[PDB]
Amino acid sequence: GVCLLIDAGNSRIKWALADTGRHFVTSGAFEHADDTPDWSTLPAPRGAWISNVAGDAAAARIDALIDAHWPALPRTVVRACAAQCGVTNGYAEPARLGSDRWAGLIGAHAAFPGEHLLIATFGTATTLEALRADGRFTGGLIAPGWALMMRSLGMHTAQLPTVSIDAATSLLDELAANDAHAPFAIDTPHALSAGCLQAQAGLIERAWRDLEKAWKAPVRLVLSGGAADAIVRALTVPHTRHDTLVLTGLALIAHSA
């Protein structure tokens, strides 16, 4: 019955064991450089389905973990394609879309049936994808995430005061503690943090409003990936968080005909 689902990204592997397209028996997560998951306890899976955007070392690690537990287990390295699980890929070259993004589109299509979606994923980059209710993925936008913008300004811009990666964390925590209002600032470090917050929220809000106007129907803004607490609090438009779009999509792929 059960399928092992692996969602490997920059530093973290998230995983689930699924007995259907939508149901997880259990799940967890671990850092790929250091950790080993507790899989000694799991029922043996029929196969594994893997989304890996973390590179070849992570691929070798995933294989090592799989084969240490279930030698020679069948596995499928998931990739974007032209059409799958109700989604049609609008990319000019479908296979150039990231596997995590493809699995996530499939999960969203299933999780929110009958709905036009704008999917915002918060990672190193902030990614926005437009998904029609009929399953057409019509395209994307990518912008730097808040920390990446803050690195540009605080560490890579000579003419601005130094704001370290760790100092940016402080400013982000303070934004959240202030419910992410981000007023015009009266000191330069706060001008950086508030301007970067305003860019993130402004991006998402603009894209959502324009998509409703373009498609002439309601659009659900779906938040995926990192918590992005300050960004989420700043938004003035309605939104729905879903934390397992990629794993859900992998379950669907695994249990498809």
**28 interacts with, out of Cl ion, a copy of itself, none, CB within 5 to 8 A per kind:** Cl ion
Tell how strand 136-144 and strand 240-241 pair up: unpaired
Say whether 11 counts as a known binding-site residue. yes
* Residue of 34, 56, 93, 166 that binds a copy of itself (CB under 8 A): 93
Residue 57 makes contact with a copy of itself by CB under 8 A? no
Give the rounded distance of the alpha carbon of 168 from its chain centre.
22
Name the strand (E) or helix (H) holding 148. Answer: helix 146-154
Two structure tokens written together for 182: 């981000």
Q: What dihedral do alpha carbons 126, 139, 239, 86 form, nearest 10°?
A: -120
Cβ 18 vs Cβ 3: under 8 Å: yes
Residue 88 makes contact with a copy of itself by CB under 8 A? no
Residue 12 makes contact with Cl ion by CB under 5 A? no
* Residue of 47, 86, 144, 226 that binds a copy of itself (CB under 8 A): 144
Residue 139 makes contact with a copy of itself by CB under 8 A? yes
Cβ 144 vs Cβ 125: under 8 Å: yes
Active site residue 100: yes
Say whether 124 counts as a known binding-site residue. yes
Two structure tokens written together for 67: 């084969």
**212 interacts with, out of Cl ion, a copy of itself, none, CB within 5 to 8 A per kind:** none
What whole-number distance in Å separates Cα of residue 248 and Cα of residue 256? Answer: 12
**96 interacts with, out of Cl ion, a copy of itself, none, CB within 5 to 8 A per kind:** a copy of itself
* Residue of 30, 205, 233, 237 that binds Cl ion (CB under 5 A): 30
Per CB under 5 A, residues contacting Cl ion are 28, 30, 37
Tell me the catalytic residues.
100
